[model samples]
Target: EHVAFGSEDIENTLAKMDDGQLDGLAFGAIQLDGDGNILQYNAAEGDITGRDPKQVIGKNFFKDVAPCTDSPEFYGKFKEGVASGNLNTMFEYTFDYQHTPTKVKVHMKKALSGDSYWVFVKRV
Candidate 1:
């Protein structure tokens, strides 16, 4: 199964999401700064990842929080995107931390406004 949105490029799509749009999404949505700091942590993301928003917001996602993603597959791509100023991609991955290995689809994109990056994840 796949997560379908109104646009083929969800990175731009997600960047336009507001409070109402975010509440209506079926997937976990996370907004981060250029430095990879967590800015917005939606309820779906917290529920899907089993992480508390309070514990996540203001923290470095790939480093302080999900070290499991600090590898090249996840973090490396993000860094490349930020540096190149053109990060919009997706891939299937598994979160193998303290919880059971859960399969997930990850979408990463840099905001068009160039202020932040969005990470949209759907559990498969």
Candidate 2:
């Protein structure tokens, strides 16, 4: 099955654009710099994480806010992408923070501009 965004492939299609182009998406979308600083946090992402952009925008995503992702499976993949200069992958994960474990689909993609990477998620 394919995820749709106005009839476009949300991942493969959005991978070709810059972070600014993703704000309109209905799914959770977050853009982080090479060093893991949160750059963009869309409304959907804020709602899903129960975090406002004000709380996440300038923070370190892997180290501070969402440390549950600091493990090898999640953060490791992100670091690998930054080092290799290519990362477009998807997987299932549970966000086990203060909230109950919620199953989600995560799509990680390096921006075409090479300035940042994107994390897109949807409840599964």
Candidate 3:
């Protein structure tokens, strides 16, 4: 409800922002290092799945966080985006949840200023 998740400009200005800035965004914001390891996880995502963050740091999103997404559509695209250096994509999927089976629209994009990728989520 804070930011429009599907706006094309959303990722364009993702240069530099603090945790609090991202926390108020109303959508899930996860920053992953080049290797797909979780580095920064925002509060919105945690509230969606009812889980805490931080512990996911250095955890591979493909192998640890959403291990079931090891398929080409997910992990494969991540590898391709990393190698190609132009990560920009979006998709809608139902995530296996801890308390509720939630459906979210996810966006994978390269940060404008950092050498990191972003996993943006908004519940549908």
Candidate 4:
């Protein structure tokens, strides 16, 4: 089943979704490591950014894929979450793209595995 965005069940529901299941999500689901490297990037994100999904695998999300987000507000929160091992944050941000500026909601949380993270996005 598809997980509903902003639902109270997100935290509990995501814990059980595998990679393929994540793609079934209505929003973008990007799996990353502690260093911000992409592990699993869903097609929804590629559609939002106008970039190819295959281009993001193993690439650094902040540096290679989306350098505009290499800020303390975005990258910093990711670091903080990984270090604390209890990530759960959401906020609004603008994406810098050749398609012009795009407003988006960013939701981040630590995966249940304790070794990875999830960066969820939905264009607004």
Best by TM-score: 4
lDDT agreement of model 4 with the native: 0.83
- Higher-scoring candidate on TM-score, 2 or 3: 3
Give the 10-residue window scoring lowest on summed lDDT in candidate 4. 1-10
User: Clash pairs of candidate 4?
Assistant: none
Lowest lDDT 10-mer window, candidate 3? 93-102
lDDT of 4 by residue, 66-114 (tens): 8888889999989888888888899999988456899999999887766
Question: Distance (Å) between predicted and true CA of 104, model 1?
Answer: 0.3
Clashing pairs in 2: none
lDDT of each candidate versus the true structure: 0.80, 0.79, 0.79, 0.83
Judged by whole-model lDDT over C-alpha atoms, candidate 3 comes out at 0.79
Provide the lDDT at 63 for model 3: 71
Winner on TM-score between 1 and 3 is 3
TM-score of each: 0.85, 0.83, 0.87, 0.88
How big is the positional error of residue 121 in model 3, measured in Å on the Cα after superposition? 0.5
TM-score of 4: 0.88
Ranking by TM-score: 4, 3, 1, 2
Give residue 54's error in model 4 in angstroms: 1.7
lDDT by residue (tens digit), candidate 1, 6-123: 2466655566666556756778888889789998877787788898866788999987878889999999999999888878888988987887788899988777785798888888
| Leading candidate by lDDT | 4
Better of 2 and 4 by TM-score: 4
